[PDB]
Design a protein around this ligand. Structure first.
Ligand code: MG
Ligand code: MG
Length: 994
RNA sequence: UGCUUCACGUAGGCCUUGGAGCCGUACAUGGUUGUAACAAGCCUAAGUUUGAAAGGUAAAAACAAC
RNA sequence: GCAUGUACGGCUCCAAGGCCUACGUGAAGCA
């Protein structure tokens, strides 16, 4: 029957078009691919895995790979996938148009369609909406027949593999009937596309459940195993499986996983007063490791090993704030400092016109950088001797070039694909442009890591990076304010106004001490500071000396510190002698170690045993550097291996430091102030020069961002009202803790702290009380911020918020841990706890109906990437409202079993629409003159078997319910209409012929 | 007697992240005088979640000589 | 007998995800 196949194909193509359009709504870079910037791994193909990708996976991987956010993340693909993905990305628009056309052609009521020609006629008065020409349709049809042939060949080979593998009498007859029909049908006929090809095309862009239903309804047969369950399974190797993740190449769940892995470990802070914490942690770790290396079962070992606390030696919070700012297309007007690459050095040398004297060596065959630089290094390119080998213009040019070369960071316009932010001592570097008297001046700012954190906090909480000004009202962006600060700093530096607040900042946090605190005449060095410096040096030297004689030093342990100590001792003795001998700066400079001599001396001392008889060592340490190395000539001659010369150096150093602590009076403080380099309190005569230096290259404090107008700030400020030492970070911690999160500070202060006793002070408090607490507080805040960023990336991956309640800890009341770290830390088990999602009626497009109920559904977090993307929540709200589902144990309306009931109702509705469409088609195809004399519903009602059971209104309600798939229970008036329709179908015997 | 769909275990592979150790490459920085600590780190307040002010120490960014 | 930073490649451990398989179960529908 042609009508049966036509209706089934119309339904299948409509479903395929709806599913395909549910993924793409806008352009999404279609037909504009430019390759992927990702390190592709050619992963081997799994055994016993059927080849072939559905159209949905083609679309998803074409979108994910050729996106732009995939910059260097080391994705995994199979063999021969990139070129076919490029072909699909080229012809996806044609594929979409072909699917839409085919759906429109098959879904016809008036003048029932015939077979689809090889040309796909689609014209004349029948279809005067020609959207595909001969060549475009030819390309799409060629792609389809290629895929059809590939699937047929793969299925035939898999079928042929069965007969060799043993088998019996029953197996032989089952494999014989299926090969002849699988190899039987073909894509091509006499200008007629076969029905099997159309079903294959329709099922290629569906899901496995709908494809299975359509294949089962394709042929009645006997409802048993359809041709050994092999012809029916021919069309389902495509039609994406569901319950299979589509976010493998998302590049936003990648950062979420990175953040989770970072947060799943305990920090190792370097505070002196936190040592008992880590001592207890080490003892516990060692004891439980020893206990775990005695087990006999996997489960017992897993239970024992849950008490071990992993640790990390450092954390990078400044990188994650900068990455968050770069992802949201912020900055955009600054110039960030990036790490220098060898390509950057090569390009700088090329543009600077310095390797132009390479006689055009044309080393372009190497292509990759860091090898051409190797060739110049082998050639004899040095660049470190070219500040004295040319006329006076050399100083203006080569010194600046050398200064640029020594810097290891470069300034570039920020980009999404750029990630190598320069982080030096937790700081970042920005470069802005200001206008003064109609001139563009570049200003460099060192931005603290707490400015960025407050910026990210303001962006995350309010949603906008705008801060309301205290005066003159109005809202200003945080991308701004920085530029105003730079301009005002420049203006104040020119005006020399360093005794008033800049932006209500109490200008000692800005304007460093060279400008805000000066004296007129040079100060007099006090007696106390020299003694303090001498005592500190003595204490450090004797501490290292005492610590050295415990590892027994058999030419091992630290050697750099020893060489530094010898060199410092020699230099200090030489300086003390030279000041008394009254030598000028140039006299001492020529009599000391320059760069080359210092490098040679360091190498010789590092390899002391290697050079003791070579003439180079004698020439350096006994001929040239005679006066400088005088205090050590006697020891170096009768010694070797450097382990004795270090002891002699430490002995001489300690003897000298003891011998000086009684030769420092008020009448000779100048000499040792010069020797130990203690200075005064700057000069007023050099205020202008320092202002000129500082007006361009200054720093940005973290108090520039004010959280006064954030929601809840006034209540928090009034609540405490007595913690005189409180700061703005307590507000951040309070806000982030009220939203749900975990930090290792909670575990440290509630599970480990009560078990240990701290060393007490003279007063009776904890020794090192202040800094320790600050340290702990610091950790908490940073960790909380990181978690927030992670949650943000979750919203960028699954499209839904992360709503979950984290349980709070309880203080320890025992003498043992009794609480495993891997069971207390929630980031270890974060994929095994239900999350909340809010479901609301969507109606048409992105328009949530106000004053409508909102439902809360609990869903496992491993179902957010497979069977939650593009789910058509209208079915969920229809099932919740129209039906009356029951709430199970801990009643919360789980997404599971809701999916199951919804799928069952969808199958029932599919049967209903098939039946109604067949009956409507038969009714219309006959009484065309009667219909042409809504009135169509009245025509159907008159041409039926109703007496008093239902009116035209009931038929209309049934038709709108069935056509649009509004999920409702069976009720009563629906059953009689279905019985009448079945009676009509059986009376004419419409679907019983072969 | 069985059929598919989910979910949980058990055992394998094949990839990708996170911490720690042993490593190796490859590159950059390292010297003597003065100017230079606004930014970041360390030490000082409370036996429980208080980074404000103050006192030391501290050379990350910068300027000029060999 | 060397310190810091950067990028890469290993080995070694732990852990987390994703894809394939092969055995058990638990549940929903169908013959
Ligand atoms: Mg999943
Ligand atoms: Mg302070």
């Amino acid at each position: 029957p042609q009508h049966h196949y036509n209706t089934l194909l119309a339904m299948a193509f409509t479903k395929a078009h709806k599913v395909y359009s549910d993924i793409r709504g806008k352009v999404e870079i279609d037909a504009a691919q430019y390759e992927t910037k990702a390190k592709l791994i050619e992963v081997e193909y799994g055994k016993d895995e059927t080849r072939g990708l559905s159209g949905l996976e083609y679309l998803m991987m074409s979108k994910h790979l050729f996106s732009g956010k995939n910059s260097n993340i080391k994705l995994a693909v199979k063999k021969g996938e990139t070129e076919i993905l490029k072909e699909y990305a080229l012809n996806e628009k044609l594929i979409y148009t072909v699917l839409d056309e085919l759906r429109n052609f098959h879904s016809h009521i008036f003048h029932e369609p015939g077979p689809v020609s090889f040309k796909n006629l689609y014209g004349d008065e029948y279809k005067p909406e020609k959207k595909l020409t001969e060549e475009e349709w030819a390309i799409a049809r060629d792609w389809f027949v290629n895929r059809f042939n590939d699937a047929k060949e793969h299925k035939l080979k898999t079928l042929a593999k069965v007969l060799e593998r043993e088998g019996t009498t029953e197996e032989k007859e089952d494999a014989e009937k299926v090969i002849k029909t699988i190899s039987g049908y073909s894509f091509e006929y006499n200008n007629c596309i076969s029905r099997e090809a159309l079903l294959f095309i329709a099922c290629m862009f569906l899901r496995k459940s709908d494809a299975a239903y359509f294949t089962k309804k394709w042929t009645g047969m006997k409802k048993a195993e359809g041709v050994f369950k092999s012809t029916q399974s021919f069309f389902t190797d495509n039609a994406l499986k569901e319950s299979k993740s589509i976010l493998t190449l998302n590049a936003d769940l990648y950062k979420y996983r990175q953040i989770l892995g970072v947060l799943s470990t305990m920090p190792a802070m370097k505070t002196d007063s936190l040592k008992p914490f880590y001592d207890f942690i080490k003892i516990n770790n060692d004891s439980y490791s020893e206990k775990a290396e005695k087990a006999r079962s996997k489960e017992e070992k897993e239970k024992i090993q849950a008490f071990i606390i992993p640790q990390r030696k450092s954390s990078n919070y400044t990188y994650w704030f900068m990455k968050y700012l770069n992802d949201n297309k912020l900055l955009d007007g600054f110039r960030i400092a990036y790490y220098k690459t060898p390509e950057d050095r090569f390009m700088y040398l090329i543009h600077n016109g310095l390797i132009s004297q390479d006689d055009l060596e044309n080393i372009e065959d190497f292509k990759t950088p860091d090898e051409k630089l190797k060739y110049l290094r082998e050639k004899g390119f040095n660049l470190k001797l070219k500040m004295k080998q040319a006329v006076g213009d050399e100083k203006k040019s080569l010194t600046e070039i050398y200064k640029e070369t020594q810097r290891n960071f470069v300034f570039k316009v920020p980009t999404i694909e750029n990630d190598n932010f320069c982080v030096k001592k937790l700081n970042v570097f920005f470069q802005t442009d200001i206008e003064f008297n109609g001139q563009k001046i570049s200003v460099q700012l060192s931005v603290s890591p707490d400015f960025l954190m407050k910026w990210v906090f303001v962006l995350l909480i309010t949603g906008e990076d705008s801060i309301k000004n205290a005066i003159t009202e109005k809202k200003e962006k945080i991308k701004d304010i920085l530029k105003k600060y730079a301009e005002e700093y420049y203006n104040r530096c020119i005006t020399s106004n360093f005794n008033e607040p800049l932006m209500g900042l109490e200008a000692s946090k800005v304007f460093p001490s060279s400008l805000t605190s000066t004296v007129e005449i040079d100060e007099k060095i006090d007696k106390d500071k020299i003694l303090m410096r001498i005592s500190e040096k003595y204490n450090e030297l004797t501490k290292f000396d005492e610590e050295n004689k415990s590892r027994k030093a058999p030419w091992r342990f630290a050697s750099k510190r020893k060489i530094d100590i010898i060199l410092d001792y020699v230099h200090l003795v030489y300086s003390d002698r030279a000041f008394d001998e009254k030598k000028s700066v140039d006299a001492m400079r020529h009599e000391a170690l320059n760069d080359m001599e210092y490098m040679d001396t360091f190498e010789y001392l590092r390899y002391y045993g290697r050079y003791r008889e070579t003439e180079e060592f004698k020439k350096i340490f006994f001929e040239d550097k005679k006066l400088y190395f005088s205090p050590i000539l006697k020891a170096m001659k009768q010694l070797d291996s450097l382990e004795g010369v270090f002891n002699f150096a430490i002995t001489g150093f300690l003897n000298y430091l003891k011998g000086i602590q009684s030769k420092v009076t008020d009448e000779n403080t100048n000499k040792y102030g010069k020797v130990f380099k203690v200075t005064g309190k700057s000069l007023t005569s050099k205020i202008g020069h320092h202002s000129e230096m500082f007006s361009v290259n200054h720093c940005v404090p973290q108090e520039l961002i004010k959280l006064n107008d954030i929601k809840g700030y006034m209540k928090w400020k009034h609540e405490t009202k007595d913690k005189l030492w409180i700061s703005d970070f307590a507000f951040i911690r309070n806000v982030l803790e009220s939203r749900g999160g975990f930090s290792n500070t909670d575990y440290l202060m509630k599970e480990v702290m009560p078990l240990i006793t701290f060393e007490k002070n003279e007063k009776g408090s904890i020794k090192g009380n202040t800094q320790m607490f600050v340290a702990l507080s610091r950790n908490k805040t940073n960790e909380l911020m990181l978690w927030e960023i992670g949650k943000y990336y979750w919203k960028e991956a699954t499209g839904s918020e992360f709503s979950r309640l984290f349980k709070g800890l309880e203080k320890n009341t025992g003498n043992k841990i009794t609480k495993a770290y891997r069971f207390t830390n929630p980031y270890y088990t974060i994929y095994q706890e239900d999350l909340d999602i809010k479901i609301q009626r969507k109606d048409k497009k992105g328009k949530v109906i106000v004053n409508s109920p909102v439902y809360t559904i609990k869903i496992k977090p491993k179902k957010f990437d497979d069977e939650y993307q593009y789910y058509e929540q209208e079915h969920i709200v229809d099932y919740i409202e129209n039906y009356e589902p029951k709430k199970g144990i801990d009643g919360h309306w789980h997404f599971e079993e809701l999916n199951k009931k919804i799928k069952d109702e969808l199958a029932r509705y599919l049967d209903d629409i098939y039946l109604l469409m067949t009956v409507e088609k038969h009714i219309v195809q006959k009484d065309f003159d009667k219909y042409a004399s809504i009135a169509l519903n009245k025509v159907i009602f008159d041409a039926l078997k109703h007496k008093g059971s239902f009116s035209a209104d009931d038929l209309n309600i049934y038709r709108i319910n069935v056509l649009h798939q509004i999920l409702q229970p069976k009720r009563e008036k629906y059953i009689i209409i279905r019985k009448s329709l079945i009676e009509y179908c059986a009376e004419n015997k419409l679907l019983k012929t072969m």
